[PDB]
């Protein structure tokens, strides 16, 4: 989780763990305890959309998870302090890969909300390190 | 189990058994008391359950009604001079100007 | 059973763990939350309509309620 | 209440956002709705039934063994028990001896079989 | 079963780390041998091409 | 009772305290009913002093019921008496009254000691005779026995059924201010 | 719903984010939760609930692994005691063993101390090293069956991937 | 190789043991109440008292065996779940195992089952202690007093319900219910005439501790209107709130530990209560109170200094050990030793959620076994010599060789001999103390292991040896095979209990 | 893990070998000592038979037989204990654990490692055959 | 070579039907798109029901011996020891001979569920089965 891969190694999967800044961890905890409604709401919305529009014959089947787009944007803005855009689309390039991983694990490969939380936390950590 | 009537009948049978035992008299005495007490207890239990459900509905409605009462009392419980305070000015203006339409 | 079929929590808990809490929220929380977000839902709908016209209400941006 | 597909149009969102919100595969959606992406509810029910059967059998065997051993060795004093067991039929003596130990042994065997994972198919 | 399966997580992790180190050392030795063989093959190819 | 954007949310029920007082009074009255029920089933002239508690040593039902009622009066768990004290303590804590909690605890301890002091005089050297005699033989009121049995049932195991009574009391107190 | 207890401190509390001032004696339950009950009591409060549970399990495993490393050093000393005579044991121990023994001491190992009093960043680093060791161990599929419960299909797929990875690793030029 | 069968097997085994115990209790109650009008013990060959007693004993034994099997399964399941949480390495996958509820039986109090190893240890210890107490209660129950036969099963059911729930309200309610059965047993089964005031004092002290614990629990519940330990962890208490909660929990648990100077109730009870009740009261109630205190303490984070609790425990241990040399009553000396052991055990968990719980659990188990052995020996002596003071009974080994040998072995075990689990628990606790306070640890080792031990031995040795010239025509007989088997079982538990897997220790 | 000892040289090792010294290495346990030995199994079987005969004789003579019963019961128990001691991967003073045994303690990893070793050996053999052919072609001139 | 031999063995197993239920179960265990989710669930349920080894078999086997012993000791009058021993031996042998409650009602369901995909003649079946093999 809190590890960085080794660039120059004789093997493929050598890593070394890291300890983030106390202030960064405080910001992450504040965002988690302040925007935690958004995550549970997004999980419930994803479940409800899979139940309702998950059937291919449904009228809203072509819409996919667009209903959770507002929740995703709100969560991104709240965890990002609304200082770098109002949606995860306007996210900086630093956290683009982690945001894409979270989007995949949330709307394509429906992993448990813990994995999606981990990916969103990676994105948030990248943003916090970039905009310190 | 699930039936209030069945629960009341069982309770009545058990109450009759306990009353007979505590009386020090032998069991199987006054057998007419058994079915009568069973029926009475079943009726009482069903009525109690129905009254509980109706009271729950009525209490929900009463709490919904009392929701505005607490807000108005807290507005009326504002300290002397705190009615016009910035943290209460909006509520005071809404309750006194907007919420005066009788 | 029947005596415990009215709430998802045990009778002992409901009697003991509901000390002056709103009984509407205790028994049917969803309606209580929806009523507490009455004007909030209208504000969210207005913000959504404005954004549909291209007007993003940043003051109402946090107002995105799932339940 | 305000989070619904009504009023949402595909023209109001970009293709990248659509792909990031595109519906998953049919099998994936069915599994997610059924919460059976890892294991089947039928498998869970089979496990529950196996656990119930094992518990009932183990309890019955233990109770039977305890009752038999108590009813076979508590005849009285040592001399009384010796004389009574001597003046018993050979099948009767075998049943008194075999049955109390057999039930406990079978329960222990069932418990040991359940407590292990020797049935794993990834074996060579 | 207590001795067999209920192994201490710390002892198991230590044994796994030691075995992984041994496997990595064996892999390094195999890589060295493969490099020596490839160098011999390349030298033979160069000599033939000469 | 907080206000957010001129929209307030109330998480507290103002009518809980009145329902709590009503439930406590009801439980005390119910305990007193059973306490005096045994007195009504016996010759009321045979129980004079505090040391006149061994007169309760009689047929096993009377002795067991008397012991259970004495325990319930002190509010020991899990009888109906403990429910009242526990709910009062919970309401006081919900109202943030530490001094009141301490005083109530001291008073409950003193009351438990006073009520249990009577249990010392319960023991008797032999079975007593406190039942009135009718038609040359002791008369036992079956209706009184049934009432006492119902009270003892509602006291010994009535703690589980506290939900319905609490709901009824809350509904009653709901219209007190409404 | 989380409630609160009214505070008795007649102290003014200043909040600059909302540019507000509130009294410690006069604060709502939400205000107490956001300002008075907002204190941190976890080593890694930035992790999720499941993430923190896994972190706690990993930290316990790491402390036990440090104890195991100290035990391994002690076992090496005991073995060298029977393997090397007292005439040459001193120099042999002075070669490298005593340095690692001093490294694996009470300050670094929980040992007989009931609590391993370490900093938050220290616990983070210890758990990080444990995670790196776990990554190295599972990179060869060594968890099954000692440290990993894997089904038949998952174990077979992991074994095939491990065979491919081993071929790729051994197919590299020497260093 | 960890399949879903093991978790389902363990949950079903726990639920089935609870339901079987409930069904047996219901059947026994129906048989006892509905076979007689007065429900008194029939003083005849054809009596329901023998059937009820046999049913209780056999049900207890069967439930104990089933609980041993289920606890092994539960330990396996817990190890597998702990590994699985630690097994996952890739961030893509997470532990998601959702099980369904069984159909045969419903959840007790409509609550899901949560399992802890300490709960299983407490359940097993309580089962063994209650079996021993019931076996020693044969000479107490008689006509019109046979109604107390099923109280031990009721206590076992209460403990099973408590050790399997996750609600603080349920835990507190179950912890409070045990007082009524104990008071009923004391008031109706004790043979001593002075036992009335002793029962009153014990009830009063237990009610005071319960009131303190109830105040703390009510404060906790009102602070956060939720009934889950996870929700409690999801909230932070203020400094004053945490201090008050910790102080109240410690006060209640120490009044129920017992702790100095709230040990007069325990002393009087052990002095006057019946042998079976005292064996059960010392063996089980103190362990239940300690388990409740440990469960509540771990769920609450406290920044205060545990110096007050540590000093209280140390002073109580010192006071209990120092009084041993002046105790001529065997029951009184055993009570003082048990008080010292309880104080030592309660001292362990004072370091919060640190690695001190295992030592406390091991010491609790060892103390339960030793106290059971000592109470059984005292009961056997009071049945044989018809006395409990050393002044009237001496030279036991000369007339009772097996009893003297058992007493010597019990003294050896109580000495914390290296082979016994008391040695391992003592080592762990002393290591933790010396890590915290070396001089205090040395002082604690000096007092209890020598002074109190010397007093207990001198009191026990003087009765162990001698020449019982007194009462030749009324000399007692040797121990029965039941007592010998009980002593052998206790020794076997104390010894073989050290060979358990270290995954939990 | 490392060697932990001060390194030496092969030349010095040969010089010491010329002096008659030896390097102490683990030796296989005798069949009488090996728990996985037919000798151990035959000894257990003979012990069980003799224990049954001695139990019969003691029943004829009244001598104590609980010791014989315990020995007979422990005959399989002793084998189980010895096999458990043998199968453990931990070491205290004995020979260091082998990578083969460490792999046998991990089935999937052992199978993958064996397959990879076979593949690497096949690649090396192919390279050796190619090198021999290249040497023959170069020698052709 | 070794990979080639494994591939040849996998092809041979794909030709066979006895190992086909194992091959189909492994393919479904990949949660791939080869089989429908409903089809995968049905096949998994059928295989799990068929592959269960209930203790009821042992409970029935033990009851037969104890029941026979009770019947012989309670009902027979002046029984012969040799005949009783012969009966006990015959019962033990028959219990050894009897199959452990073999069931085929779930075996045909597996065949019906698996035959629809034509596993042997399926290009993706070999690709999925090459990676996964017991």
TrEMBL record, chain E:
Residues 20-47 form a coiled coil. The keyword Coiled coil applies. The keyword Transmembrane helix applies. Keywords: Coiled coil, Membrane, Transmembrane, Transmembrane helix. This is Transmembrane protein, putative.
From TrEMBL, chain G:
This is Uncharacterized protein. It comes from Tetrahymena thermophila (strain SB210). The lineage of its organism: Eukaryota, Sar, Alveolata, Ciliophora, Intramacronucleata.
Automatic annotation (TrEMBL), chain H:
Keywords: Cell membrane, Electron transport, Membrane, Mitochondrion, NAD, Oxidoreductase, Respiratory chain, Transmembrane, Transmembrane helix, Transport, Ubiquinone. It is a multi-pass membrane protein. GO terms for molecular function: NADH dehydrogenase (ubiquinone) activity; oxidoreductase activity. Its main location: membrane. InterPro entries: ComplexI-like_HydComp, NADH_UbQ_OxRdtase, ND/Mrp_TM. One of its GO terms (cellular component) is plasma membrane. Residues 167-451 form the NADH:quinone oxidoreductase/Mrp antiporter transmembrane domain. The chain crosses the membrane at residues 12-34, 54-74, 117-137, 146-163, 169-189, 201-224, 244-265, 300-321, 357-382, 403-424, 436-463, 484-504. One of its GO terms (biological process) is ATP synthesis coupled electron transport. It is found in: Cell membrane; Mitochondrion membrane. Its EC number is 7.1.1.2. It catalyses: a ubiquinone + NADH + 5 H(+)(in) = a ubiquinol + NAD(+) + 4 H(+)(out). It comes from the Eukaryota. Pfam families: Proton_antipo_M (PF00361). Core subunit of the mitochondrial membrane respiratory chain NADH dehydrogenase (Complex I) which catalyzes electron transfer from NADH through the respiratory chain, using ubiquinone as an electron acceptor. Essential for the catalytic activity and assembly of complex I. Belongs to the complex I subunit 4 family. This is NADH-ubiquinone oxidoreductase chain 4. It comes from Tetrahymena thermophila.
Automatic annotation (TrEMBL), chain I:
It comes from the Eukaryota. Keywords: Membrane, Transmembrane, Transmembrane helix. This is Transmembrane protein, putative. It comes from Tetrahymena thermophila (strain SB210). The chain holds residues 58 to 198 of 205 of the full protein.
